[PDB]
Amino acid sequence: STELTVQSERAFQKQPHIFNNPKVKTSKRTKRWYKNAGLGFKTPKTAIEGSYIDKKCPFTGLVSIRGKILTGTVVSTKMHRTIVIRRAYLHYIPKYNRYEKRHKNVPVHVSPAFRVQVGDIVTVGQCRPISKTVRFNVVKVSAAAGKANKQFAKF
C-alpha cells in the first residue's frame, strides 16, 4: 500500500549498503537498487521508477521468491502493504464421487509497486516467512479493475 511520505517512520528508511556519496554531485539524488525475481515476472516499471523502500518487496527488497507459485483472487486489501486472497477449489469426495466447493485464504505481502483493488486475480509467489502469517508475496496482477470506467454516468 504505502502511498507517499516515503520517510515517515521513527527510523530512516533506506536501502541497505546502497551508498550515495554527498561529495559526488548527482542529478538523481538517491541511487536505487533492484533485480528481476525470475521465472519470467516482469519487474514492473513502478519499482524502478519508485522512491518507496519496502525491504519485503520481491524486486527492490531483500526477499527471494522460491517454492510455490500460486494464483488467487484478492478478497481483502485492508492491512498496510499486505492483502488476503481467497483460493477456491473443488474437493473430491470418493464415496459420493462428487466434489464440494472449498477455499483457503492466503495472507500475502504486496509491494507498493502494484496498485491492488479488491476482486483482482493476482499471481503470488512463495517466500521466507515475512511475518507470523504471510508466507507469500504478490508477483503479478493478472486482473485490472473489471470494468471500472464502465461504471460511469448516463448518456
Binding site: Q7, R10, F12, K14, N20, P22, R29, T30
Partner: peptide, 12 residues
C-alpha cells in the same frame, strides 16, 4: 551521519 540520513536525524 552524512547525506539524507544526517538531514533526517537532525530534524528529529
Amino acid at each position: 551521519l552524512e547525506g539524507e540520513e544526517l538531514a533526517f536525524y537532525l530534524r528529529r
